[PDB]
Amino acid sequence: QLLDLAQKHFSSLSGTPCRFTGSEIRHRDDALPLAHVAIAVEGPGWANPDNVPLQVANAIIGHYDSTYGG
Amino acid sequence: GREFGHLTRMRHVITYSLSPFEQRAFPHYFTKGIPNVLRRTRACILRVAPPFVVFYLVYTWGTQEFEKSKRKNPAAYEN
Numbered sequence: 422q423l424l425d426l427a428q429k430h431f432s433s434l435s436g437t438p439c440r441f442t443g444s445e446i447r448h449r450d451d452a453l454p455l456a457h458v459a460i461a462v463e464g465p466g467w468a469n470p471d472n473v474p475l476q477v478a479n480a481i482i483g484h485y486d487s488t489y490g491g
Numbered sequence: 492g493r494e495f496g497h498l499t500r501m502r503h504v505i506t507y508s509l510s511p512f513e514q515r516a517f518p519h520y521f522t523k524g525i526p527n528v529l530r531r532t533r534a535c536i537l538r539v540a541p542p543f544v545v546f547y548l549v550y551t552w553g554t555q556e557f558e559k560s561k562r563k564n565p566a567a568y569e570n
Binding site for chain 1: 503505506508509510512513
């Protein structure tokens with residue numbers, strides 16, 4: 422059903438590897454109550470298998486919030 | 492007391508940096524360094540050198556005058 426609907430409606434339709442740079446941006450603003458920090462490294466692409474173990478690695482580091490009961 | 496975190500209050504200042512492994516340790520060392528050295532030398536040569544030039548003049552005169560003093564005086568041995 423979806424395929425025939427697409428053929429009905431969507432038939433009338435038309436037929437740069439980025440460079441990771443180690444750097445920093447510091448927006449110093451002492452008026453803000455809390456400091457936000459985000460630190461990253463060059464990761465893999467979507468098709469790279471290494472995405473699977475790396476997520477596991479992140480799962481080991483985990484996440485925390487002040488409202489967590491753990 | 493004196494630690495990063497409470498030294499001063501600064502707002503709305505954005506700083507951009509680069510990894511030391513992404514940049515050259517000697518960027519334009521001579522193309523821009525040499526003109527900069529000349530600028531710094533020119534700004535200071537008329538405030539540092541003149542006092543030392545006076546010392547050299549005094550040093551030369553003192554050395555010469557001391558030599559002349561030890562030299563024989565012909566008039567003293569006249570008659």
